[PDB]
A paper describes a structure:
Both proteins display a novel fold with very similar general features. In [name], the interactions between subunits are exclusively mediated by this extracellular component, which buries 1800 Å2 of the combined molecular surface in an extended dimer interface. Whereas in both structures of [name] determined in detergent and in lipid nanodiscs, the two transmembrane domains (TMDs) are separated by about 7 Å and thus not in direct contact, they have approached each other in the TTYH1 and 3 structures by mutual rigid body rotations of subunits by 6–7° around an axis located at the extracellular dimer interface. In cryo-EM maps of the three paralogs obtained in detergent, the pocket is filled with residual density reflecting its occupancy by small molecules. As all proteins were purified in the detergent [name], we cannot exclude that the observed density would reflect the interaction with its cholesterol-derived diosgenin moiety or breakdown products thereof.
The Tweety homologs (TTYHs) are members of a conserved family of eukaryotic membrane proteins that are abundant in the brain. The three human paralogs were assigned to function as anion channels that are either activated by Ca2+ or cell swelling.
Residue numbers in the entry:
A (entry chain B), B (entry chain A): 6 to 73, 88 to 416
């Protein structure tokens, strides 16, 4: 399963990012860049211009009608509004699902990075402090024994090699903090956006239902209030279309080159080869951690051989401080367990799956949901324009 | 993230399973057992009895009305039907999402098991065939050299140890086939179920819309066909409630003890320690594969030591057919790569995540969707009962 850009992503990416004063920006995902933000603002301003044109057209139509089948038009408008609200519910659910998929992927990546850091730090601190303490305690036990201290200093050098090899592993403390911040911000924004769109759907349904009630019961003050709220809802729906279009364009622009964006943004705290390994994930047997993991496992194996040989030969001679030998053997066993867990976590599979899940959430689900919310906004605008244009005819009966 | 049974699961599991002849049957999940299937059939028969009682009540009410505000009742029935169809859409989407989550989890577990089997088989066949061929070819190269053949036979014994250790790993060929069959069946059943419920929603909405149309236009002939279709839709909705209730009870009974069910069903194909390891993720415990992976890595390290020492020493003397030594070194490098990939894949994390994702799909999403579909069925039955009971009054005006 390798990522491939969907069709709608590459259609939306083809949308000219033209900026404010009609100057073509390069249209490559780069938030913070003035030109890209200006292109998004230009899309928002285009949607606002469409809103202004629609309001002007509605005002002109009402002026012409009031200075110069309607039930069928009202029924058609209500049906179109109901279809729009259904499409909006579908799009809102899809966008929320995509955002939550991204949140889960980020949380899983954060958990894996924190686990890698925890094992690295624990193994290093253990093999330093506890091992040096045990060897120092054994130092006096093996009194006047040249070979039995040569083997202990060999153990010390091998532990130093272990610590040196582990220290060369990437530290994900910064990356965990960035992922936590991104996850919290995504959760906050997604919650507020879903709540706002749910309130918009509820308001739209209430307005349509009360307008139908006023049509049935021939209300006078009720209908005027519903038309005022209809103008307000048309304004709000065009603003929602602006937001949905800008967000969808930005999302498609990012999703065209997600690996490129991730490589560029993570040049600081993550090495290039590690990022390429976790993003493209070649099955060609080339892992940046392979050499250090092999060195660590060889060092652990060697120390186990020396400690086992010492235990086999120290019992006939001393048999006094063998509790320290068993403690060291247990420490090496736990270190090998930590080795297996680490070489499992530093593997591509989990992080590549998390990255692919995040991309699927924010492109296959989030972007489709944004498109459907834009379709909702356009359909609601059309329905409410039809409701307002057929306004005076029902008002004058 | 550890699995915990939700509240609604333990409420639904508390539902008595009393069989057909009112004999209490065990509530533990056992689809193959006859008594459990009889309890599910009893739940279906209870729902059918409720359907029959509702039909009898409707017939009695119509007989009383036809042998002896209505617009408000029709509007209330239409509103309740619309709410029911919305709840049914939500439940259908949720159930489909849960089933697809289960399908994805099963596919991921299948991919991991297939990869483990592929690495094991490839490494075994390589270390047998290619290594024996290279050593046999080197046999004549090191003619009349006892030490350089003792080292080669040592390499042969270490390769045999590698093959023996790898052969002790579980073979997932059977589990792969079972997972493929389960995923295919789940996909087929989910597709057909979603299509059937979508058709039911479409039919219900069409019937309600045409009934509302005939209410205003006073077309009695169409409303007789709509009454017949309403009786049929009430029957179908009660059948759907039967299916949803039985499936929800079965799902809750399974989900109370998913670990127990998985352990009991997978007793011969998979060793019990392996199942416990991948189900209760023993991060603080131990891995059943740790000993064999340690033996395999130690063997690879040893053989690399002998081959490196031989290459360092054989080139100055012979320098003939040393491409075989480089090929053996490349083979050992690829074998260490396969070792790292295997010890990554045989880890607990990936399979435990797949299992937890499957449980979340079929319990947090599938069961909730089934409950909402049952609520849809009950609400649609109530709405159509209200539509039929207010039948003769609108018919006779
Ligand atoms: C991401 O992982 C980090 C681990 O580094 C989590 O941070 C810890 O969170 C626990 C939970 O309250 C705190 O008790 C610790 O003090 C935190 N430690 C550090 C170093 O921050 C973090 O919560 C995780 N975030 C997510 C969203 O999973
Ligand atoms: C550290 O691990 C080793 C190997 O697992 C333990 O040595 C024994 O190894 C044999 C394998 O030939 C096992 O059958 C024994 O069960 C192991 N001993 C025990 C007590 O389990 C070694 O004992 C471990 N270290 C400690 C402190 O227990
Ligand atoms: C589960 O994994 C198995 C691998 O053992 C897949 O089976 C292979 O599928 C490919 C795809 O067409 C075939 O070309 C092979 O002949 C199959 N091999 C065997 C041994 O069956 C299977 O497709 C996977 N299933 C899912 C749902 O992912
Ligand atoms: C198998 O791997 C070893 C170790 O990676 C290769 O030996 C060289 O090891 C040093 C590390 O001290 C690397 O810097 C060299 O790049 C390695 N050599 C090469 C050619 O890359 C050994 O060469 C590998 N086997 C083969 C056939 O290339
Ligand atoms: C956009 O930027 C990329 C990278 O900086 C560059 O390769 C590309 O040529 C730019 N586009 C244009 C039209 O110059
Ligand atoms: C990242 O993108 C910016 C803007 O296109 C560019 O200036 C910079 O060189 C890029 N970084 C890398 C490492 O290519
Ligand atoms: C159901 O079976 C389990 C195990 O076979 C048993 O422990 C339990 O008591 C049984 N249920 C009843 C009600 O006896
Ligand atoms: C599996 O469940 C059946 C039915 O409850 C029981 O008879 C059997 O002993 C169980 N298997 C195991 C291994 O417990």
């Amino acid at each position: 399963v390798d990522y491939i850009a969907p069709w709608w992503v590459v259609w939306l990416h083809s949308v000219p990012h033209v900026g404010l004063r009609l100057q073509p920006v390069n249209s490559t995902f780069s938030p913070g860049d003035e030109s890209y933000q200006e292109s998004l603002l230009f899309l928002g301003l285009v949607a606002a211009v469409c809103l202004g044109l629609n309001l002007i057209f509605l005002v002109a139509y009402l002026v012409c009608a009031c200075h110069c089948c309607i039930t069928w038009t009202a029924v058609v408008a209500g049906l179109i509004c109901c279809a729009a609200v259904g499409v909006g519910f579908y799009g809102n659910s899809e966008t929320n699902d995509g955002a939550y998929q991204l949140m889960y992927s980020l949380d899983d990546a954060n958990h894996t990075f924190s686990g890698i850091d925890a094992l690295v730090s624990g193994t290093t601190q253990k093999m330093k402090v506890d091992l040096e303490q045990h060897l120092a305690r054994l130092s006096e036990i093996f009194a006047a024994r040249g070979d039995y201290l040569q083997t202990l200093k060999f153990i010390q050098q091998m532990a130093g090699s272990v610590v040196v090899q582990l220290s060369g592993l990437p530290v994900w403390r910064e990356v965990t903090m960035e992922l936590t911040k991104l996850s919290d911000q995504t959760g906050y924004v997604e919650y507020y956006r879903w709540l706002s769109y749910l309130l918009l759907f509820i308001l739209d349904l209430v307005i349509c239902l009360i307008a139908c009630l006023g049509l049935a019961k021939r209300s006078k003050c009720l209908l005027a209030s519903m038309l005022c709220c209809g103008a307000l809802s048309l304004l709000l729906s065009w603003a929602s279309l602006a937001a949905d279009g800008s967000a969808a364009v930005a999302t498609s622009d990012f999703c065209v080159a997600p690996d490129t964006f991730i490589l560029n943004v993570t040049e600081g705290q993550i090495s290039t080869e590690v990022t390429r390994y976790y993003l493209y994930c070649s099955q060609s047997g080339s892992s940046p951690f392979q050499q250090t993991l092999t060195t660590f496992q060889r060092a652990l194996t060697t120390m186990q051989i020396q400690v086992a040989g010492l235990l086999q030969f120290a019992v006939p001679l001393f048999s006094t401080a063998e509790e320290d030998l068993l403690a060291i053997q247990l420490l090496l066993n736990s270190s090998e367990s930590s080795l297996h867990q680490l070489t499992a976590m530093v593997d591509c599979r989990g992080l590549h799956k998390d990255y692919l899940d995040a991309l699927a959430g924010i492109c296959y689900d989030g972007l489709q949901g944004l498109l459907y919310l834009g379709l909702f906004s356009f359909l609601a605008a059309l329905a409410f324009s039809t409701m307002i244009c057929a306004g005076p005819r029902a008002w004058k009966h």
